[PDB]
Design a protein around this ligand. Structure first.
Ligand SMILES: CCCNCCNS(=O)(=O)c1cccc2cnccc12
Lengths: 13, 347
């Protein structure tokens, strides 16, 4: 199972 | 050895010519970086091409179509992206490469920043990949070669890209790639420290809060090649925290249909140990370009766009958007008061 749609960038963790 | 005399000499000479090309490219980049254009009502807004937003627009005077990125100044400040947004504009205005999207205009108003780019009508690689499932190895290799050359160019200029993924790779009318989305691109001589990128594509050293270098782009290339050839990325889970745990373990499993040459390349790109990762060694980009998986790749022919593309998107007209998904349309509101003027004086 995982993300199949468009993936957004992250600006911080 | 692996190469006979004629082959070794041709390869050596080719590699020296690359150095000569890159030295000239650096001279040209620096001149633009040192001595670097429109307004909103010059364009008709047609349709949203992507959000995160980018709109297809038509220039009123010429009738040319473009992709206009619109950034809300207040949101940029709150998300701590001021410097990143200045980086994107400055880098795009100074670079020049066949696989990098071209910036045509930039401007700002009371509310927004605008970057007007060439419209690439074939759609995102992401769409095509999700629709077909996976690309065959030759098809994936054709795209991968373009990224290798693009990173060879960018890294020679001390530019790190930091957001490789199929969503950011557009297919042009000839079936070649245009890289978009330079919001995380940065001039970096050695190390940098910002935690940014897209979870599935982050190298372990980013997740582990280490100072990291341009080798994060080579890790991301490994993720991209894997995803193109498998249909899904190598570290795959529903939530970011779970993705990060898989990346830092570094255990990678491969589909049974991957060739051994491909698996070898990917083990060397998806390498946690930076002293062993391809693209980060003494031989530089040549460890990648000379790998067996790329043995059929004519690097100059790719650069010259003379290789027949595996896939040519359908195109019905200059403003056609059939290769793009639909998004909710939001009117572009411009406040009567200037927002964040001091923060964006240099834009
Ligand atoms: C997470 C999904 C990210 N997708 C980014 C790439 N697609 S886009 O629509 O924003 C776009 C951006 C920039 C230039 C373009 C030039 N022609 C077409 C589209 C363009």
């Amino acid at each position: 199972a995982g993300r199949t749609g468009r993936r957004q960038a992250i600006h911080d963790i | 050895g692996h190469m006979g005399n004629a082959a070794a000499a041709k390869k050596g000479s080719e590699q020296e010519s690359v150095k000569e090309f890159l030295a000239k490219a650096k001279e040209e980049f620096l001149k633009k970086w040192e001595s670097p254009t429109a307004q909103l009502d010059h364009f008709d807004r047609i349709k949203t091409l992507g959000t995160g937003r980018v709109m297809l627009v038509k220039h009123k005077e010429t009738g040319n179509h473009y992709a206009m990125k619109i950034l809300d100044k207040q949101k940029v400040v709150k998300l701590k992206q001021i410097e990143h947004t200045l980086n994107e504009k400055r880098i795009l205005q100074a670079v020049n490469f066949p696989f990098l999207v071209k910036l045509e205009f930039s401007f700002k108003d009371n509310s927004n920043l605008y970057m007007v780019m060439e419209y690439v009508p074939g759609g995102e690689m992401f769409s095509h990949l999700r629709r077909i499932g996976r690309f065959s190895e030759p098809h994936a290799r054709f795209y991968a070669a373009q990224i290798v050359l693009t990173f060879e160019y960018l890294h020679s200029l001390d530019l790190i890209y930091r957001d490789l993924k199929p969503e950011n790779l557009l297919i042009d009318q000839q079936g070649y790639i245009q890289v978009t989305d330079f919001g995380f691109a940065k001039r970096v001589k050695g190390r940098t420290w910002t935690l940014c990128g897209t979870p599935e594509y982050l190298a372990p050293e980013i997740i582990l809060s280490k100072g990291y270098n341009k080798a994060v782009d080579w890790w991301a290339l490994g993720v991209l090649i894997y995803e193109m050839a498998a249909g899904y990325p190598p570290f795959f889970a529903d939530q970011p925290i779970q993705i990060y745990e898989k990346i830092v373990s570094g255990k990678v499993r491969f589909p049974s249909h991957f060739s051994s040459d491909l698996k070898d390349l990917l083990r060397n790109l998806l390498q946690v140990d930076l002293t062993k990762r391809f693209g980060n060694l003494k031989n530089g980009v040549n460890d990648i370009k000379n790998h067996k998986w790329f043995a059929t790749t004519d690097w100059i022919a790719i650069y010259q766009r003379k290789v027949e593309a595996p896939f040519i998107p359908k195109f019905k007209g200059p403003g056609d958007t059939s290769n793009f998904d639909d998004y909710e349309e939001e009117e572009i509101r411009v406040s009567i008061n200037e927002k964040c003027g001091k923060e964006f004086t240099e834009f």
